[PDB]
Structure formats: C-alpha cells, structure tokens
C-alpha cells in the first residue's frame, strides 16, 4: 500500500529555480531508491537522474536531486529552466519486490495570428446514396481564433440530430482547421429544397449553400 | 559634464552602465570639442544612451 | 549498444489473451545478469509498471496486475514476451520493454512504445465516400475536395492523396465519436479550380486494424 | 508585495512604490544594481492545479 505523492502541475518561468517533491505514504523514502524520469510527449522515458544525487552522462549538471527522509518526500531541483525540459517527471520506488511510480509532474508552456475563416461544402454522394445513408461534410478551416460554433440548416429549421463537429486543431500555417457532419437519411436528404451550413466566427458568418442535384 | 565620470574608479549613471573601467586600466584616453559639427539648430537627437 | 523493439498485434478485444513480444538487437537475454521488465502507460495517466521477469523462471508481479500477467522467456530467439488475460476497456496504455541493469533501482534503455488503446470489438472497415466539389465548394481562385471516412472502428486510419505525392494543402482532421459507437472523419486538399476537370485526385484511405484499403478517385459533381 | 526594508506593524497597509536593495548594492530608489522591485506580476492562469 506503499505509493508516491506527486505535485500533478508545476509551473515557473525559464531561468529561475523550482523543485519538485516525490512524498511517500507509508514507508519512508530513504528506505529505497529513488528515479527521477524525463520523458517527451509521444517519446519513450529517459532516466534523468538515480541513486538519489548521482546524475548519468549526458543530461546537465542542473538536474540535481535531494532525500528529506524526516519528510518522507524526495526532492528534484532544477535551475535555469529551458525550452527542452518541458516534460513529465515520474519518481520511481521498490518497496518490496513490487515497483511503484510516481503521480506525475506536468510543467505548464507558456497565440496564433487571426485569419479568415473559409468554410466548404460538399453534398452526399451518388455511392452513398446508393448505400441508403446521406452526409452532409461542412469545413471550416486556415482560421484564428478557434472558437467557431456550427449551426446545420435545412432550408430555413436548423438541425440538431445526427450533427457532429470536430474541435478546432492548429495547421501547417499557424492556423485552425475544423469539420462538421451531418447523417441523414437519403429521404431526408432529398425532402428539403436546400441544405445549408452557417458557421459563426468572432461575430461574423461565412454561409454556404447545397441543394440535392 | 560626464568627462569627468570615465576614469578607472568611479560610481555614476553613464560608466556603470555602458562601459565600466577596471582597476587594471591601462587604456588613454583623448576628446575635444566639436559643437560645430556632432550638433545643429532645432534639437539634435540622432545620439541615444 | 543494445536496443529494444517491440512486436505483437497492437490491439486486443475484450475479455481475451494479449500478445506483446519484445526482442532483442546487439545483447544476449542470458548473458550480464540483467533484469526485463514491462511497463505500462495510459494517455495522459502516469507510468504502471506492470512486472518483471528474470531469464529463468523468477517473476513478480503487481498486485493490482496479480494473477493476471504470464510472461515467458525463450532464449534461443533472444526475445521475451508478455500475455495479459482478461482485458478491459481500461487496460489502453502504452506498452514499453526495458532493460533492468539494477532491479530495485533506474532503467538504462527504454523500447519504444507501441501505444495499445482498444474498448471494443466492432472492428469495422472505413467507408470512403467522395466530396465532389462544384461551383458552391469553391471561395474565388480555389477550389476544395476531398473524401468522407466515416463509420470505422476502430483508431486510426492513414489517408493520403496520390499516394502521398500531395501533401500541400491537405489537412487531415482528427475523428469524434458518432451518435452510435463508431467514429468519422476526412480529409480535404485546396486546389485551384483550373486543374478540376484535368487532374485526377484519388485519395488513400487504410485502415490497418480492419486490413482495408479503399482508393477512391474525386471527381466534379454531375448533375442529375 | 515580495521586498522590503524591515519588519511592518501588523493592521498596517504598504503602498510605497519605490525600488528596494534586495540585492548587495544600493537601492533607494535609484537605479543602481540588482534592483529588483517589490512589486511583481502573478501567475494566475485557469488551467493550473
């Protein structure tokens, strides 16, 4: 029952000095060993520091590590914060033949340039129609800021059921991209005159129109 | 005014922060006037500190 | 040096047997009396070790993961392998294999992680459906198009345009669950509107988990 | 407020907006060296712990 208390999000500015504490429960922490671990978002884990004070060849000289044991709780330091030390830190224990890891360190980064929100639309497919099933696909993308509402309409009743929307997600260019889509029914598709998608963006809207052709 | 503030030595608002002078100056140093020339009529600004 | 990598399906249905094997490259599994062990971590979760095995029969596991884990060691293929029984939708995680210089102390190397996130068993292949562009999907000198991907199980599904000989413009957008498990996305390109009706677009949509690859060819709407 | 010249009496407010010597060298409100002010930014943002 022997677990590693963790500060979940630790923040501060490039430059200065934080500390990050690793707090036993029951056993004490200068009981066993204690691992630090620097591992990159979509990266394998990389040892960043053992045995409590022995640092390995490679990583810097500022990744120094202290044991308070009247505590309980191990303490990471860390100087002069760079761009590159943006990753989780994991502690890691033994306690008895069962090896437990920390909570987990989170370390906080830190705005794109506005654009203009250009919106398409595309009518379901003749191969989709075939299938019995109708999607109306709206998209909205190379835009800033992402915050954009989607309201689907059918001719002038906006449509609620079966419509999904994407969050916004960066581009290439510094910009935003987002989808939307709406199932239908092939009868449904093909009952109203028009299907429109309007798409809201920092007051003004870019509607586009498709009608069954 | 500020001649007399570049000398190895001193504490001020111009050597301490542009050019400080170690003790161990061995450096010469030489000006004159040229009021006719480094300044002109309306508000000569171009220098900045 | 040495180096890990791992192999295995990189799913699993529910309630049955997990296979991850994970070899080994420029070392011995015997040799230097070394430890393996199998590390786990979910997205966004911190890291769960999982057990450790030796390369005789000593093992250990973790009591949460107790009479759950069967790992083996063969060491004629330099290799070992781990099997889960009994998986969950809460066992998506990323599996690692590393090497264990010192048991109760640091790792030296980590394998690379082959993320497996999987909660059911729907494993439906990906409808490619064609975004003809017309006179309406278009904003002034350029046009957009593209193709529908939806009703697929499960993540994730590589598109491509001309097999990957367009890449500018092409934006591919990540999938939202639907109103009935299953998920939906596309993936679009910006193209003027003078090489409409003169180039052929044909998008590449695989779906590894369902072993489908459909190509579909966009085309100019024609009205009906 | 993160700098001052000494102690305060308690039920007292502190509104002096003058640079302190928290560093070595002098400060009084001139310029001098490491003069930090007492007066910083926070960090407040809603996505912390």
């Known amino acids: 029952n022997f677990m590693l208390t963790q500060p979940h999000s630790v923040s501060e500015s490039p430059g200065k000095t934080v500390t990050i504490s690793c707090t036993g429960s029951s056993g004490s922490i200068a009981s066993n060993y204690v691992q630090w671990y620097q591992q990159r978002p979509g990266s394998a884990p990389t040892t960043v520091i053992y045995?409590?004070?022995?640092?390995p060849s490679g990583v810097p000289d500022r990744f120094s590590g202290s044991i308070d044991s009247s505590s309980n709780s191990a303490s990471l330091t860390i100087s002069g914060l760079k761009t590159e030390d943006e990753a989780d830190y994991y502690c890691?224990?033994?306690?008895?033949?069962?090896?437990?890891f920390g909570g987990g360190t989170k370390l906080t980064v830190l705005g794109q340039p506005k654009a203009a929100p250009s919106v398409t639309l595309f009518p379901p497919s003749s191969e989709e129609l075939q299938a019995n099933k109708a999607t109306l696909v709206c998209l909205i993308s190379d835009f800033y800021p992402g915050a954009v509402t989607v309201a689907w309409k059918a001719d002038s009743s906006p449509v609620k059921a079966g419509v999904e929307t994407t969050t916004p997600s960066k581009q290439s260019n510094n910009k935003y991209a987002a989808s939307s889509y709406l199932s239908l029914t092939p009868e449904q598709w093909k009952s109203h005159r028009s299907y429109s998608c309007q798409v809201t963006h920092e007051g003004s809207t870019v509607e586009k129109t498709v009608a069954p052709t | 005014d500020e001649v007399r503030q570049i000398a190895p030595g001193q504490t001020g608002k111009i050597a301490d922060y542009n050019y400080k002078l170690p003790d161990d100056f061995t450096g010469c140093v030489i000006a004159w006037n040229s009021n006719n020339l480094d300044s002109k009529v309306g508000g000569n600004y171009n220098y900045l500190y | 040096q040495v180096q890990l990598q791992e192999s295995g399906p990189g799913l699993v249905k529910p309630s049955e047997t997990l296979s991850l094997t994970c070899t080994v490259s420029?070392?011995?599994?015997?040799?230097?009396?070394?430890?393996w062990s199998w590390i786990r971590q979910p997205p966004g979760k911190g890291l769960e070790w999982i057990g450790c095995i030796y390369y005789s029969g000593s093992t250990n596991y973790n009591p949460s993961l107790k009479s759950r884990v069967t790992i083996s060691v063969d060491t004629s293929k330099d290799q070992f392998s781990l099997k889960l029984s009994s998986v969950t939708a809460a066992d998506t995680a990323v599996y690692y294999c590393?090497?264990?210089?010192?048991?109760?102390?640091?790792?030296?190397?980590w394998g690379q992680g082959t993320l497996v996130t999987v909660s059911s068993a729907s494993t439906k292949g990906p409808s490619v459906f064609p975004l003809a562009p017309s006179s309406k999907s278009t904003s002034g000198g350029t046009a957009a198009l593209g193709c529908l991907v939806k009703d697929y199980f499960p993540e994730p599904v590589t598109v491509s345009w001309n097999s990957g000989a367009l890449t500018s413009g092409v934006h591919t957008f990540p999938a939202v669950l639907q109103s009935s498990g299953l998920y939906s996305l596309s993936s679009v390109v910006t193209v003027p509107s003078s090489s409409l009706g003169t180039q052929t677009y044909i998008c590449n949509v695989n779906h590894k988990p369902s072993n489908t690859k459909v190509d579909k060819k966009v085309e100019p709407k024609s009205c009906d | 407020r993160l700098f001052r010249k000494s102690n305060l009496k308690p039920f007292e407010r502190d509104i002096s907006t003058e640079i302190y010597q928290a560093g070595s060298t002098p400060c009084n409100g001139v310029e001098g060296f490491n003069c930090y002010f007492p007066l910083q930014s926070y960090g407040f943002q809603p996505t912390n712990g």
């Open positions: 890691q224990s033994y306690d008895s033949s069962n090896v437990v």
């Open positions: 045995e409590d004070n022995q640092r």
């Open positions: 420029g070392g011995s599994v015997s040799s230097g009396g070394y430890f």
């Open positions: 590393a090497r264990q210089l010192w048991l109760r102390g640091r790792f030296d190397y």
